Design a protein around this ligand. Structure first.
Ligand SMILES: Cc1ncc(Cc2cccc(CCO)c2)c(N)n1
Ligand SMILES: Cc1ncc(Cc2cccc(CCO)c2)c(N)n1
Ligand SMILES: [Mg+2]
Ligand SMILES: [Mg+2]
Ligand SMILES: [Mg+2]
Ligand code: NA
Ligand code: NA
Lengths: 560, 564
């Protein structure tokens, strides 16, 4: 197919495969035609809603084979990451709900246990599928159940350390489970997995349904750790995607620069000025936007695969020799290198900059990818310099400030673009520990840590509030907070991070320790997992738009 | 091979001539076997004097000599994994006559440490970091045009961690010029197929105690290019027969030549056996810490429900998550400092899904001579900001058992944190019964000052409270917090004091701060806890005093605040 349908294709057989037992009723002769229907409805429905695209086109036949040959949902099927799982959803009672994909109150971006009994594990972060399936298998065995346990994992996901840990452990307990390797990013692998204790079969053609069905059949009942190697084509069945798998990894349905592009430009600009700079990403070159950097400074660019943990200790090692590494990494994925950041960087006070993207609410990918916690989990770590730029110009300057600082520094910023203010093309740092009064008013002061500043300024128009662009969580601008506490009736902290442990709480700690008893209102993300929606809707829910902030401030003021 | 530890200093005229590697490299190969025996004698003596790690260093006496003999250290970079085997390395790097200060306040640290010496390229303690660190130094040196060598020594156990696999793959990708030495002491003297497949030139296994083979092999490999993997085989406790015979007992020892209560970890382990006796669903998981966390008895009684995942904290937690999906009841036994490494798995695979998994967090707080690399300083801070977590802090043995029962019965993610060591030895109710969630326990009614204690500083706080006539609350829960008790005390007292063995920043005391601020309660608030720096190693009692967490420290802080 060469152009995505705009009208609901006719799929009479797929309308008979609404669920795995219904599908299993059909005969193998129909499976190939079913795959044409499925592929077609998928291209259609993702045209309607936008979403992940090329990877699910790659697993159409594999997903049909899997539900054909296995007794789902009693047989446990774990999809790694989940971006490839739209065919799975279409085949598990959610075909007609696909119109809701990634809309508020609609189907989630990934498999989700609460969404369907056919989803055994909520995924999004990669590489968790083997560990989870092994755990389900260890339990089924003790329970004397006879269910099967299958993980479909891609070749990128397999570069992650936890996947190695799971494969080793599965061998240790001689677990009866199947790992299917959906190899698409394409010489001689079998002996490796055999050395790890896994029975290796393959590689087989992942769009050759009769061979998939038969091979799956023989392996369904084999015992112990089984490893099937399947090969697929990303975007299979859609030429524009087969030829551009990067750009068709996700499609939007039929302003200023992105913060990540501001970072990428700062990265090239500093590299041109300082040969010490090294750029590190764990398999997120496009998203963190190291693209130009990687083309212009190839010998100083490191893609460590999906190995967040090694990315960080690697950088500690580089800094030991006087190089200046910059680890580009999303807030949600830095969760996975927390120990390397604490033990290998911060404990040694090594000179490493973390450029933390996707900080705050990330929109439709939902809570598995939210950057809700990095202020809280980093600021309790001694030695960290922790920064929250408010716009594009501030991101450029605080990156420069952290880079030049001799020690560990973190700069957090959101997905998407900003208020599109002017960016100074100089590369100069700003004073560490100092906020910027953006607005002198009275009565109530808004202490903003990050990109809600523009909403705070709108609120302060009507309330004539003081507004501060705090810039630093740690070290906090203690002298400004102390003056503001002595001259206002209310301090209001604002952040796109958990309130619990977050930046407002550092203000709170500082007020308590000096016995300053001024009222404090902490605005931030609440203590729950925010359901997927447009970014603007998640922020409105969390009260971090101008109307939410104004309502909270006015209420607190009316109560004292 | 010896059988007794020397009580006075051995005669080591050749080791006395090898006070640094440069001096060592001026000796001849024919001297090295005698140096090896003198080093071993010295090692036995000085660890007998100070206490410290023992058997693993015995295992690397010959390898350490060979390494500093063949490599141009400190210019050539040597990274020791974990570092508990690195006493022979310190003895040879200008520190021999300092080993009397080992693991003492202001003495040598437990592990290699960059600030301690130019011969330590990387601070270690946690495991499996050496290959990543050495690869980064190899990459940097090459971009700088330096011709220096990069060497990582890693034990067979550390190679079970995922980050070691991630580093072995990436080193292959960049075709790095480095040497990984696998110090394998679970084998005795096929075997390299794994490393060969990951792009590494594999050599061995060789005899890690044959200095002539070690020196010649190392010399050949020093000069080869690309990712080089040398497989060496050593014996636990080599050359000291009691440690060869009992390498668990001789992993570490006390200085040569009072009853107390049971260790918190042993209370935990008893709880685990008792609850497994009653609930066939309970499964116990440890990431290679059976002795430390103390699943020994449980492993023997319930072996089909005991899982040691090796040094694989990350997989430990996701494996629990998958177990909980089939209705089983995993308990992850994991140190606070090591749980740092599975944080993404706890957040994304457990909390986000609200799966019923219990975390028994040992080594909460300061851990003593092992130092800041192992400190359990942050787990209240990094867990309480996570939606869905039930976060508990028992004050003594009976409270620890009660709060393990409470977190288990809870259907959802729950955490119970307790320190190394033993407690104040209060009686322990043999029942298995919970307590109510989110409710503290008033231990003393006084006036003016209320001490809100999260954890095991309660006995010291009681001493202060008796001196001041203060109120004392055993809070039990950081999340959900006993908001009603806190509200009441904030109205009836002039000062609230929180005490916890965790970073003040983001800590349980800050949860009290947040609550007061959100309700507009304006009572003065003094937060006592761990300060914003890495506390240098010392006895636990000395580290607590430094931080203000003994009764003297608490009282001085409180009195000082009351004087304004
Ligand atoms: C732990 C973890 N780290 C990073 C990602 C993002 C990612 C990078 C590369 C490939 C993929 C697969 C499809 O995109 C995902 C993740 N999902 N989980
Ligand atoms: C990440 C990490 N996890 C656990 C340990 C504790 C440990 C378990 C097994 C073997 C060893 C080696 C010597 O004891 C240490 C650690 N050091 N680092
Ligand atoms: Mg892939
Ligand atoms: Mg070992
Ligand atoms: Mg011992
Ligand atoms: Na600016
Ligand atoms: Na160095």
């Amino acid at each position: 197919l060469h152009e995505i349908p705009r009208e609901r294709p006719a799929t009479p057989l797929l309308d008979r495969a609404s669920s795995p037992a219904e599908l299993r009723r059909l005969g193998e002769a129909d499976l190939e035609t079913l795959a044409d229907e499925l592929r077609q409805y998928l291209l259609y429905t993702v045209g309607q809603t936008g979403g992940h695209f090329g990877a699910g086109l790659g697993v159409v036949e594999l997903t049909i084979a899997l539900h054909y040959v296995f007794d789902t949902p009693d047989d446990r099927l774990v999809w790694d990451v989940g971006h490839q799982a739209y065919p799975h959803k279409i085949l598990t009672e959610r075909r007609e709900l696909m119109g809701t994909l990634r809309q508020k109150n609609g189907l989630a971006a990934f498999p989700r246990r609460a969404e369907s009994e056919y989803d055994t594990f909520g995924v999004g972060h990669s590489s968790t599928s083997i560990s989870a399936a092994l755990g389900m298998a260890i339990a089924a065995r003790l329970q004397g159940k006879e269910r099967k346990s299958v993980a479909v994992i891609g070749d990128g996901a397999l570069t992650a350390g936890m996947a190695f840990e799971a494969l080793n452990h599965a061998s240790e307990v001689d677990a009866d489970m199947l790992v299917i390797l959906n190899d698409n990013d394409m010489g001689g692998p079998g002996t490796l997995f055999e050395e790890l204790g896994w029975n290796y079969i393959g590689p087989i053609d992942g769009h050759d349904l009769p061979t998939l069905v038969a091979t799956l059949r023989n392996m369904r009942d084999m015992k112990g750790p089984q490893f099937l190697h399947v090969v697929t084509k990303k975007g299979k069945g859609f030429a524009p995607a087969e030829l551009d798998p990067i750009g068709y990894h996700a499609i939007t349905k039929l302003g200023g620069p992105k913060y990540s592009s501001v970072f990428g430009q700062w990265l090239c600009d500093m590299a041109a000025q300082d040969a010490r700079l090294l750029g590190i990403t764990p398999a997120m070159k496009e998203g963190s936007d190291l693209v130009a950097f990687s083309e212009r400074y190839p010998e100083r660019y490191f893609d460590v695969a999906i190995a967040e943990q090694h990315a960080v200790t690697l950088a500690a090692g580089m800094a030991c020799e006087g190089m200046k590494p910059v680890v580009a990494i999303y807030s949600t994925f830095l969760q996975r290198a927390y120990d390397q950041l604490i033990h290998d960087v911060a404990v040694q006070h090594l000179d490493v900059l973390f450029a933390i993207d996707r900080a705050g609410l990330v929109g439709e990918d939902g809570p598995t990818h939210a950057g809700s916690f990095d202020i809280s989990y980093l600021r309790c770590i001694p030695g960290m310099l922790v920064m929250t730029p408010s716009d594009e110009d501030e991101l450029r300057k605080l990156l420069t400030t952290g880079y030049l600082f001799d020690g560990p520094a973190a700069v957090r910023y959101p997905r998407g673009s900003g208020p599109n203010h002017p960016i100074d093309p100089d590369l100069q740092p700003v004073e560490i520990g100092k906020g910027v009064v953006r607005r002198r008013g009275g009565r109530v002061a808004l202490l903003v840590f990050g990109v809600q500043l523009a909403e705070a300024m709108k609120v302060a128009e009507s309330l004539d509030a003081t507004v501060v662009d705090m810039r630093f969580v740690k070290p906090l601008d203690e002298a400004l907070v102390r003056e503001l506490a002595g001259s206002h009736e209310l301090l209001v902290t604002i952040e796109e991070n958990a309130v619990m442990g977050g930046a407002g709480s550092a203000v709170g700690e500082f007020l308590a320790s000096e016995g300053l008893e001024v009222p404090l209102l902490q605005l931030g993300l609440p203590d729950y997992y925010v359901e997927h929606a447009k970014p603007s809707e998640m922020l409105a829910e969390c009260g971090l738009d101008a109307a939410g902030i104004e309502k909270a401030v006015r209420q607190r003021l009316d109560r004292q």
